[PDB]
């Protein structure tokens, strides 16, 4: 059975994280037209706030927002951990990195 | 300079931590079964007729 040699190159300080997005209303057939912007909290002194992040996705018609804090932050980001594996098919080596999962949602204000 | 969607993942790995089963020995009871009530040895009659 096909197997890969596992390596956690991972994050140098653990400060580095990749970014996974999931859309609550399904898939985007071809999101190539989406622009993602990652926002971080300016407060680096408060351990609670220093890991707060907002991911915004803008389309022509709607905006999506995901956050890792508050109601929008969901349980899967903690109870479980997410990683990204980059497999080199030639070497059979899988490099594994920490990942952060954002659940994306639509933007409207009264 | 922004973030763009990249190629779809080709596979998923789900990790869980699991221990294994031991041999079946099925040691039902310390002193097992319903041990039967029984005769005290010898006993002897504790009663006699008159005469």
Swiss-Prot record, chain A:
Gene behind this protein: POLR1E
Job of this protein: Component of RNA polymerase I (Pol I), a DNA-dependent RNA polymerase which synthesizes ribosomal RNA precursors using the four ribonucleoside triphosphates as substrates. Appears to be involved in the formation of the initiation complex at the promoter by mediating the interaction between Pol I and UBTF/UBF.
Compartment(s): Nucleus, Nucleolus
Family: Belongs to the eukaryotic RPA49/POLR1E RNA polymerase subunit family.
Name of protein: DNA-directed RNA polymerase I subunit RPA49
Positions of disulphide bridges: none
PTM comment text: In normal conditions, deacetylated by SIRT7, promoting the association of RNA polymerase I with the rDNA promoter region and coding region. In response to stress, SIRT7 is released from nucleoli leading to hyperacetylation of POLR1E/PAF53 and decreased association of RNA polymerase I with the rDNA promoter region.
Region of the whole protein represented: 6 to 115 of 419
Modified residues (Phosphoserine): 30
From Swiss-Prot, chain B:
Phosphoserine carried by residues: 26, 34
Region (Disordered): 18-41
Compositionally biased tracts (Pro residues): 29-41
Top-level taxon of origin: Eukaryota
Subcellular location: Nucleus, Nucleolus; Chromosome
Family listed: Belongs to the eukaryotic RPA34 RNA polymerase subunit family.
Subunit structure: Component of the RNA polymerase I (Pol I) complex consisting of 13 subunits: a ten-subunit catalytic core composed of POLR1A/RPA1, POLR1B/RPA2, POLR1C/RPAC1, POLR1D/RPAC2, POLR1H/RPA12, POLR2E/RPABC1, POLR2F/RPABC2, POLR2H/RPABC3, POLR2K/RPABC4 and POLR2L/RPABC5; a mobile stalk subunit POLR1F/RPA43 protruding from the core and additional subunits homologous to general transcription factors POLR1E/RPA49 and POLR1G/RPA34. Forms a heterodimer with POLR1E/RPA49. Part of Pol I pre-initiation complex (PIC), in which Pol I core assembles with RRN3 and promoter-bound UTBF and SL1/TIF-IB complex.
Biological function: Component of RNA polymerase I (Pol I), a DNA-dependent RNA polymerase which synthesizes ribosomal RNA precursors using the four ribonucleoside triphosphates as substrates. Involved in UBTF-activated transcription, presumably at a step following PIC formation.
Misc: It is in an antisense orientation to and overlaps the gene of the DNA repair enzyme ERCC1. This gene overlap is conserved in mouse, suggesting an important biological function.
Full protein name: DNA-directed RNA polymerase I subunit RPA34
The species this protein was found in: Homo sapiens
């Amino acid at each position: 059975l096909p197997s890969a040699r596992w390596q956690y190159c991972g994050a140098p300080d653990g400060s580095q994280r990749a970014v996974l997005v999931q859309f609550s209303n399904g898939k985007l057939q071809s999101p190539g037209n989406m622009r993602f912007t990652l926002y971080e909290n300016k407060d680096s002194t408060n351990p609670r706030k220093r890991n707060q992040r907002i991911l915004a996705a803008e389309t022509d018609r709607l905006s999506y927002v995901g956050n890792n804090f508050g109601t929008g932050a969901l349980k899967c980001n903690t109870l479980c951990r997410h990683f990204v594996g980059i497999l080199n098919k030639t070497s059979g080596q899988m490099e594994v990195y920490d990942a952060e999962l954002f659940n994306m949602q639509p933007l409207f204000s009264d | 300079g922004g973030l763009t969607c990249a190629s779809a993942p080709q596979g998923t790995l789900r990790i869980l931590e699991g221990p294994q089963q031991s041999l079946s020995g099925s040691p039902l009871q310390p002193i097992p079964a319903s041990p039967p009530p029984q005769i005290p040895p010898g006993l002897r009659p504790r009663f006699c007729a008159f005469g």
